[PDB]
Design a binder for this molecule. Structure first.
Ligand SMILES: [Mg+2]
Lengths: 270, 223, 116, 203, 244, 266
């Protein structure tokens, strides 16, 4: 699907000739085939649109999950680029000592947006997070914490396609970064359950709590424009970096982000 | 007032090194330094042990041959004989070294080179050959030319082996072997350790005695 | 942050203060201080104050990482249908409630006494 | 040496202080190091102090000043409430940020003043928290109104659209009984080390 | 400090792996490295706490009810679950499944065959868990067995932390109702910690994490891996963890 | 095992007892599973697996808390030689000294056990009882946790008059023959009084020195060391440090008992 990566020669920074294939080319194939098996239609269309159509539905659930999985990976890979560091095939794999190493995210900073233009994006990040280093710590540490199949998302709060404020969120297995598609499904289910019980307070209080959790400061609902995705699953990093080198992998990913794409994704501010 | 050894303590002389020492340095009635050197050269076994043997051969070569031969001659005789006689013999050989008539023990010059003049660099030596047994005897024995005598003690006593050492130190391999033989006439390592670490009243609280016994068992006996 | 003072074998430990995170030991101010002392000994930072600052900065990152770990673990649990019967804040509220009930009955009696 | 071991060891690690265990004044942060036991060690009265501690104490946590006094008793108080306040704060998940335009102190002779927060929160402000129901915009927390509102081990300033008479005026000075929900807006931290929260009453 | 236990015929395992299901490298990835990593993480979490003294299972049971300190629970759960999985795998320490076990299965699954049950388990594994997880065949206080999937570090023992289905994705009405019922049951417990009674015991744990299969079987073929594991597992161990 | 267990019907679920048994079985086989926990202190392990006098270090003593003396203001200056320095408003006991005295004490405990003497472990503090009883069991010895009635040795005939005496082999077999009333009424004095709180039972110590019995005591930084034959400098207040010293002593006496049994067998 993507242009920047290929089957013969992967990125010099992150992945290796075999490890890249295991991470990306094989996974994508598995997902697409699975999606085809689920739905008789072979038309790809947009993935996001399909998700929106089939969300809040247990029967049309698997397909949605597979669309999310495909989309998220693609989003992650679009952001990535080459790097200065040596390939993991040359380097030795990290042992149990990697756990005890102090992280340098607090003290050091590298590969900022400023170095390749992207000034307004950097300013927006600073406004959101206090600084670049603080943002980075938020991102990488969150990704480490996921511990399983998941994705860390840099997002923008959609209220032209205007935005209010940048944010970051984690999402797991095949969870979407878009709030509007899944906002209030649990509340609806609760309401249905209450209706069923009636047919056959605390519940009212719980509903009220749910409502106040969901609803924003003004608008009827809220949505998030994704700017950056970073995968957290063993699928990618176990091949090259082993068990102990998740943090190292994340560092490498961070070094090799193409910030121009992220800047382009970022819409105009209010 | 003793204390246990640290948890990072390792006994310097490994098993393979001890085995190669045993192979090389054990000699017959008429053993020599040359024979030892030959044995070291032709030893075969572990690679590390072979390297060790080579290293010790090198350091023997570096040191003086005549003095080594004299020491070799002395040690078997001293093992055979009793304390006072051995001391006398040692005194006689020291005297001979001091006043070398035959001029075959370059000692005073070597001392000057080392102790007086400079700490660095070994002495080149000016005498390197196999001395005869009669010559060796003459070197380590008295004559009527000079009178020799030790100064008299209060307790003018003589014995072949020490009266009080064996009790108050770690027990020799030989003693362990003797115990094993006695036990035979089943036996196991733990039982041996218990016997040595608990039953023997002088050696109940010996510091590194169990470890020593284990090392001995590893070296000699089999399952 | 609670501190267990009941020692485990003091002889058994073997901490290289090249880094803060030791295995048997937890992350705390002590670990920082040990790191500062190590730095002083090695003369990476000749000054004591600078070494202390460095150790503090090492600690902070680790603490932030620890904080993020727990929150994300909680999020994961929430996502995959885990059920926690009593949350910490809920527990606290419950604890307060009993005390308040005790106070109220007593306070009413005291007001009655004051009236009479 | 022994001296070195003593300096390393867990009693030397507890930094000494002779502050009151009973302080009826304003408490903005922890005074004393909380010290826990395991259940097993509690069962045989051992806390890793000079002496055994009375069998009357069944709580695992405590606070102390002196290992041994002239009165032949350790000066302690069996309570570790400050950890629970911190844990409540963490649960609430409202990240402390300096309202004054300043860099975060954790990033980059001696200053005894509190470096940023005192370590109740090493959380960073930029994150969102998703759930089955969705992305939580407003943090819902139950608290008690005093007259100010007690919200999960912290007193907090409160604001509302209209002052509700039915709940308030029915029980004027027994408002502490009824727990109300709150929407915590933000948490600032002043120079004295007080956490100045700001909540909003929900009905 | 928590350290990995010494497996029987460890050197042989290192040389080979496991005859049928896992390679030398694949076994190292799942156990000799990953388990060690997990143990180290657990130690780091619970170094100076009261939890340091307790075993992983007992830690998990202590922690389960607490919403915060979920990381500890996750780690403890993983450690225990992974060693159960390894125990199930091991060649020795040929054995067939027990007669009693077969009778129990028959009682549970409407008088179906063991092959059929296996097939149902693999289908459940395929369908239920996305990403990582665990696949247990458990036994509860009602003597009949049942199949239990968990989504990453969900324990088979304590039902509020079964972690049995993903609410990140959309869910059914029946599933929601079941969740609501569980929540109600939890609320009914009435203790200060708020922890229900539960007597679920795992009989056949299987590791649906990528640390087991991904090296040998690739990103796909997790089902195939699960099938292989089911075919070749230590039956004596299973028999031992069955009777009251 | 479990002869009265009424097992539930196959169609029915598990009973409560059956369920409990199943849990126990699980605990024995597969609960302690996931990991093993090296390098951690279990309180019980010091009573049931104390180290030999040889293998004790200064580090182990420090971990036990033996170094922590009474207080700076509760100082008997008689004990000055034993104390290392002061810190945290507390005198700290020199622990090399403690070690040497402990070894000396341990050796005398072993010796009397070997000779077949009556060792008596005296420990009036609250938590000490169980460990004291264990120590008394270990060597074929005796203990006192409930208070020492003044004059058990000095006024033995009045106090310890109506309790059963026994006979014993070179081994420890009762050889149950009838003791004569003259044979019974004689005092049976200990050959080692070993106390865990000498400051709390001065009387027992005084009785021992009058009754001509060698005695061992955990001398804290407020206790008089001259009042006993073999003082061990250390922390008598904390329960675990006392247990550690006591357990060591018991182990030393146990060894000597074992040696005596071996030589009897020979
Ligand atoms: Mg005292």
């Amino acid at each position: 699907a993507l242009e920047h990566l290929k089957e013969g020669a992967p990125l010099k920074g992150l992945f290796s000739i075999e490890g890249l294939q295991k991470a990306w080319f094989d996974r994508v194939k598995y997902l697409d085939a699975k999606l085809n098996d689920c739905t008789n239609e072979a038309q790809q269309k947009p993935l996001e649109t399909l998700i929106h159509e089939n969300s809040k539905s247990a029967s049309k659930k698997h397909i949605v999950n597979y669309a999310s999985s495909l989309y998220n990976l693609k989003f992650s890979m679009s952001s990535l680029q080459g790097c200065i560091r040596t390939p993991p095939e040359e380097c030795p794999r990290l042992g149990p000592e990697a756990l005890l190493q102090t992280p340098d995210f607090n003290r050091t900073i590298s590969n900022e947006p400023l170095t390749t233009g992207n000034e307004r994006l950097q300013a927006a990040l600073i406004s959101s997070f206090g600084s670049l280093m603080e943002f980075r710590t938020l991102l990488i540490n969150s990704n480490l914490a996921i511990s399983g199949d998941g994705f860390t998302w840099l997002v923008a709060r959609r209220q032209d396609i205007e935005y209010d404020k940048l944010f970051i969120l984690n999402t797991y297995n095949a969870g979407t970064p878009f709030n509007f598609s899944t906002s209030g499904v649990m509340n609806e289910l609760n309401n249905q359950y209450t209706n069923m019980e009636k047919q056959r307070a605390k519940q009212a209080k719980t509903k009220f709590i749910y409502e106040t959790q969901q609803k924003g400061f003004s608008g009827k609902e809220v949505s998030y424009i994704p700017l950056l995705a970073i995968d957290a699953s063993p699928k990618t990093w176990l091949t090259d970096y082993g068990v102990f080198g998740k943090r190292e992998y994340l560092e490498r990913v961070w070094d090799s982000i193409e910030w121009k794409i992220v800047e382009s994704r970022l819409p105009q501010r209010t | 007032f003793v204390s246990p050894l640290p948890k990072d303590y390792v006994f310097k002389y490994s098993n393979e090194k001890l085995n190669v020492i045993e192979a090389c340095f054990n000699l017959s009635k008429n053993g020599t330094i040359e024979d030892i050197m030959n044995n070291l050269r032709q030893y075969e076994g572990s690679a590390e042990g072979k390297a060790f043997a080579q290293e010790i051969k090198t350091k023997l070569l570096t040191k003086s041959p005549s003095s080594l031969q004299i020491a070799l001659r002395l040690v078997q005789e001293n093992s055979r004989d009793h304390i006072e006689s051995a001391i006398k013999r040692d005194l006689y050989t020291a005297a001979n070294m001091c006043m070398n008539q035959d001029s075959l023990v370059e000692f005073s010059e070597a001392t000057k080179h080392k102790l007086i003049d400079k700490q660095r660099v070994p002495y080149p030596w000016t005498k390197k050959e196999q001395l005869f047994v009669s010559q060796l005897t003459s070197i380590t024995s008295p004559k009527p030319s000079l009178p020799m005598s030790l100064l008299r003690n209060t307790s003018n006593v003589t014995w072949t082996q020490y009266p009080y050492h064996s009790k108050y130190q770690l027990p020799t391999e030989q003693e362990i072997a003797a115990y094993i033989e006695k036990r035979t006439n089943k036996v196991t390592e733990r039982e041996v350790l218990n016997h040595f670490a608990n039953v023997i009243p002088s050696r109940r609280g010996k510091l590194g005695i169990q470890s020593l016994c284990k090392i001995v068992c590893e070296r000699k006996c089999e399952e | 942050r609670p501190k267990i003072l009941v020692e485990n074998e003091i002889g058994d430990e073997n901490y290289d203060w090249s880094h803060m995170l030791q295995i048997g030991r937890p992350l705390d101010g002590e670990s920082v201080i040990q790191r500062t002392m190590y730095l002083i000994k090695t003369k990476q930072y000749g000054d004591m104050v600078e070494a202390y600052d460095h150790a503090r900065y090492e600690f902070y990152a680790l603490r932030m990482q620890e904080e993020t770990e727990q929150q994300v673990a909680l999020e994961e649990a929430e996502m995959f249908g885990s059920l926690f019967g009593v949350s910490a804040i809920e527990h606290g509220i419950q604890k307060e409630q009993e005390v308040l009930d005790v106070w109220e009955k007593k306070v009413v009696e005291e007001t009655e006494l004051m009236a009479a | 040496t022994l001296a070195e071991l003593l300096g390393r060891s867990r009693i030397a690690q507890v930094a000494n202080n002779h502050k009151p265990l009973t302080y009826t004044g304003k408490k903005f942060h922890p005074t004393h190091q909380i010290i826990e036991t395991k259940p097993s060690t509690l069962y045989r009265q051992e806390w890793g102090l000079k002496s055994a501690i009375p069998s009357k104490i069944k709580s695992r946590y405590l606070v102390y000043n002196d290992l041994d006094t002239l009165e032949r008793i350790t000066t302690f108080e069996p309570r570790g409430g400050t950890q629970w306040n911190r844990l409540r704060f963490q649960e609430m998940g409202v990240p402390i940020v300096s309202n004054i335009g300043r860099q975060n102190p954790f990033f980059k002779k001696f200053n005894t003043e509190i470096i940023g927060t005192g370590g109740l929160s090493y959380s960073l402000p930029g994150k969102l928290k998703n759930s089955p129901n969705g992305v939580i915009q407003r943090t819902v927390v139950p608290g008690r109104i005093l007259n100010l509102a007690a919200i999960g081990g912290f007193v907090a300033d409160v604001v509302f659209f209209q002052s509700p008479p039915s709940s308030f005026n029915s029980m004027g000075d027994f408002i502490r009984m009824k727990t109300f929900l709150f929407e915590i807006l933000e948490a600032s931290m002043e120079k004295n080390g007080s956490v100045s929260m700001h909540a909003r009453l929900l009905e | 400090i928590h350290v990995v236990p010494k497996l029987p015929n460890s050197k042989a395992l290192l040389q080979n792996g496991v005859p049928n299901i896992l390679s030398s490298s694949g076994f190292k990835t799942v156990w000799f490295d990953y388990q060690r990593y997990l143990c180290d993480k657990l130690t780091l979490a619970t170094a100076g706490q009261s939890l340091e003294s307790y075993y992983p299972f007992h830690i998990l049971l202590k922690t389960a009810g607490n919403p915060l300190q979920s990381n500890i629970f996750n780690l403890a759960s993983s450690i225990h679950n992974n060693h159960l999985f390894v125990e199930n795998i091991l060649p020795s320490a040929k054995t067939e499944p027990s007669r009693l076990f077969l009778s129990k299965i028959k009682d549970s699954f409407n008088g179906s065959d063991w092959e059929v049950v296996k097939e149902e388990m693999i289908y459940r594994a395929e369908n239920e868990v996305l990403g990582q997880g665990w696949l247990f065949l458990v036994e509860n206080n009602e003597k009949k067995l049942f199949i239990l999937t968990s989504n990453n570090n969900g324990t088979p023992y304590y039902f509020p932390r079964n972690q049995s289905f993903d609410l990140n994705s959309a869910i059914s009405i029946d599933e929601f109702a079941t969740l609501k019922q569980m929540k109600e049951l939890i609320g009914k417990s009435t203790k200060l910690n708020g922890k229900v009674q539960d007597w679920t015991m795992p009989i056949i744990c299987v590791n649906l994490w990528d640390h087991a299969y991904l090296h040998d079987y690739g990103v796909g073929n997790r089902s195939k891996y699960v099938k292989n594991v089911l075919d070749n597992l230590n039956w004596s161990v299973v028999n031992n963890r069955i009777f009251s | 095992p479990y002869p009265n267990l009424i097992p539930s019907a196959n169609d029915k679920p598990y009973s409560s007892q059956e369920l409990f048994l199943r849990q126990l079985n699980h605990s024995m086989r597969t609960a302690k599973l996931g990991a093993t926990i090296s390098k951690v202190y279990y309180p019980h392990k010091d009573i049931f697996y104390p180290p030999l006098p040889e293998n004790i270090t200064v580090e182990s003593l420090m971990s036990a808390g033996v170094h922590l003396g009474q207080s700076t203001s509760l100082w008997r200056s008689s004990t000055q030689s034993y104390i290392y320095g002061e810190y945290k408003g507390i005198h700290i006991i020199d622990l090399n000294q403690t070690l040497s005295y402990l070894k000396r004490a341990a050796k005398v405990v072993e010796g009397v056990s070997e000779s077949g003497g009556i060792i008596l472990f005296l420990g009036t503090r609250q938590g000490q009882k169980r460990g004291l009883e264990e120590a008394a069991k270990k060597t074929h010895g005796y203990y006192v946790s409930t208070r020492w009635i003044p004059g058990t040795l000095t006024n033995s005939t009045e106090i310890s008059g109506i309790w059963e005496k026994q006979e014993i082999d070179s081994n420890d077999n009762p050889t149950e023959r009838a003791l004569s009333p003259n044979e019974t009424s004689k005092q049976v004095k200990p050959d080692l009084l070993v106390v865990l709180n000498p400051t709390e039972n001065r009387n027992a110590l005084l009785e021992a020195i009058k009754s001509r019995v060698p005695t061992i005591a955990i001398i804290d930084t407020d206790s008089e060391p001259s009042l006993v034959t073999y003082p061990i400098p250390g922390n008598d207040d904390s329960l675990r440090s006392v247990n550690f010293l006591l357990g060591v002593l018991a182990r030393a006496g146990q060894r000597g008992l074992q040696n005596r049994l071996a030589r009897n067998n020979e």
